[PDB]
Amino acid sequence: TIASSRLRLLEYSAFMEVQRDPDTYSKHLFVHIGQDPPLEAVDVRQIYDKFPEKKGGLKELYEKGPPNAFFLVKFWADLNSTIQEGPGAFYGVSSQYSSADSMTISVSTKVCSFGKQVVEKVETEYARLENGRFVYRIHRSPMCEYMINFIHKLKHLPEKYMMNSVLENFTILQVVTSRDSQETLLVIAFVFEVSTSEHGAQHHVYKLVK
Ligand SMILES: O=C(O)c1cnc2c(cnn2C2CCCC2)c1
């Protein structure tokens, strides 16, 4: 469970959806996190090299704190072409959060490639009271053309070891802050590999410590 003292990640999924006919849709999940067990710890200094981006970077954010907001998710992305991709295929990202307190949050998603920030998405979300808790939803946020082209380039590689060498240099840094106070609520560093398993995409969550 990815949760700080102020915010919990309920769900996260990167996917592509193709419309076979007006009433039929197929959805392929590249990565997914759904739905508390104790988490294994990873020293944050072991991944500073993987996130070398200076301003809005990991080292600076960790020093600002609180340390309880920092998590690392290692993904094994399912890049198998299970669904037949056609012309109007939608590539998107959906995520949900919850908190005990009502807040306006700001979700910044930094996509990095070769140690350089390539895309940054900033989305403001308002609290919705739901079953005594406050929920935040980012539904079907479209992937930018950079990310759709990166996935095609990855799928067109003749070997899964070649895709791992590319994914070695690809990271995503998600920073959720309170909109008005600018306080760090949740930080998730994402690192990637290609899934070799028949059980599809897999992930491992770690608590970042110092
Ligand atoms: O927020 C985004 O735009 C975004 C773009 N691409 C993403 C994710 C999560 N996984 N992936 C790809 C890595 C390789 C498989 C799919 C999120």
Summarize the structure.
By secondary structure, the chain is mainly β.
Structure characterization notes:
- The protein has 210 residues and is mainly beta.
- 12% of the residues lie in helices and 51% in strands.
- It has a single domain, classed as Coagulation Factor XIII, Chain A, domain 1.
- The protein has three helices and twelve strands; from the N terminus they run βββαββββββααβββ.
- The two termini are 20 Å apart.
- The structure holds 1-cyclopentylpyrazolo[3,4-b]pyridine-5-carboxylic acid.
- 1-cyclopentylpyrazolo[3,4-b]pyridine-5-carboxylic acid is lined by residues 14, 30-31, 77, 93, 109, 111, 143, 147, 151, 172, 192.
- The PDB classes it as transcription.
- The entry lists the keywords activator, DNA-binding, nucleus, phosphoprotein, transcription regulation.
- The assembly is monomeric.
